[PDB]
């Protein structure tokens, strides 16, 4: 995409990877093979996101009718615990390439990525009430829609009539989606329009990361800290229930994050 090494793809005119670059120059299966192979940085990070989700959805409250999952990418690790606390899930993404990988996975098509190592891992955290083939069927039955997203749009779902949600989940999304704090803050107001009053916001993402790599192809990220996200959340109409910060970072070659944040909020 012209630039090559000097600046992330689709970030020369703008200074941040434009949304177009996610539709055209983005291979989702290449990304899944890199980050979600699954005791490296990636595996340890995925294991921490998983523990936080098992605690949010299985250990604590966060029970409901409908959970809208914003910017799911081509991944399902983030929905394994919520398919126990929610009667229905509505997954979304900007990339059609990503929505495709999700739709292939809901069909159990052999050409879809293997989530077996991950699914079995979450089963072990839950005590193993069920096994992999049983856990994946609960989650697939729970996915009611796969829709196009745009957190950087007043109506994040467009014309789709969706009922108010009890939870809105977003993992590893807004750092790539928003190019500056005004957009990060606005994109959180947009998530609130999908949420019920006193409804949960669950956000997980990297801290202090300005880029992330998918091979040799580079992508933009918003380098923000704990103070920056804490402030962005509260100003967008949310009361923060708890905020976790971990020091684990992605390997040298994969991103310059100083750690990762996990937080639960409530639309107030
Ligand atoms: C693969 C992935 O890039 C997500 N993976 C990762 S792995 C990793 C590792 C380290 C750091 C980071 C990181 N990231 C996210 C960025 C930070 C993806 O699938 N994303 C995020 C970007 N996203 C959108 C783009 C533009 C506009 C959007 C509008 N609405 C909704 C979504 C939109 C689409 C879904």
Numbering used by the authors: -10 to 27, 31 to 260
How is this structure described in the published paper?
Nicotinamide-N-methyltransferase (NNMT) is a cytosolic enzyme that catalyzes the transfer of a methyl group from S-adenosyl-methionine (SAM) to nicotinamide (Nam), yielding S-adenosyl-homocysteine (SAH) and 1-methylnicotinamide (MNam). NNMT is the major Nam-metabolizing enzyme, and systemic knockout in mice fully prevents MNam formation. As was described by Peng et al, NNMT possesses a class I AdoMet-dependent methyltransferase (MTase) core fold, comprising a central seven-stranded β-sheet, flanked on both sides by α-helices. In addition to the MTase core, there are two extra α-helices at the N-terminus, which, together with the β-hairpin Y203-S212, form a cap over the active site.
Based on the X-ray crystallographic data of our hits (1) and (2), the question arose as to whether the introduction of an appropriate 2-hydroxy-2-methyl-propionic carboxamide-based linker on (2) is able to transform our nicotinamide pocket binder into a true bisubstrate inhibitor. In our case, we saw the synthetic feasibility of transferring the corresponding structural motif directly to the imino nitrogen of compound delivering compound in the process. A subsequent X-ray analysis of confirmed the binding mode as a bisubstrate inhibitor. The binding mode in the SAH pocket of the part that is common between and is identical. The position of is slightly shifted with respect to the position of the tricyclic in, but also here the positions are very similar, showing that the fusion between the two inhibitor classes was successful. Further profiling on human and mouse NNMT enzyme revealed that a bisubstrate binding motif does not necessarily translate into an improved inhibitory activity. This may be related to the fact that a bisubstrate inhibitor has to compete with two substrates, SAM and Nam, which may be more difficult to achieve than when competing with a single substrate, especially when the second substrate, SAM, has a high affinity to the enzyme (Km = 1.8 µM, compared to 400 µM for Nam,). Based on our crystallographic data, we obtained the correct linker length allowing the important interactions with Val-143 and Tyr-204, and we also observed no obvious strains within the bound ligand. Our rational design towards the bisubstrate inhibitor starting from the fragment-sized nicotinamide pocket binder revealed no beneficial impact on in vitro inhibitory activity by addressing both binding sites of the NNMT enzyme simultaneously.
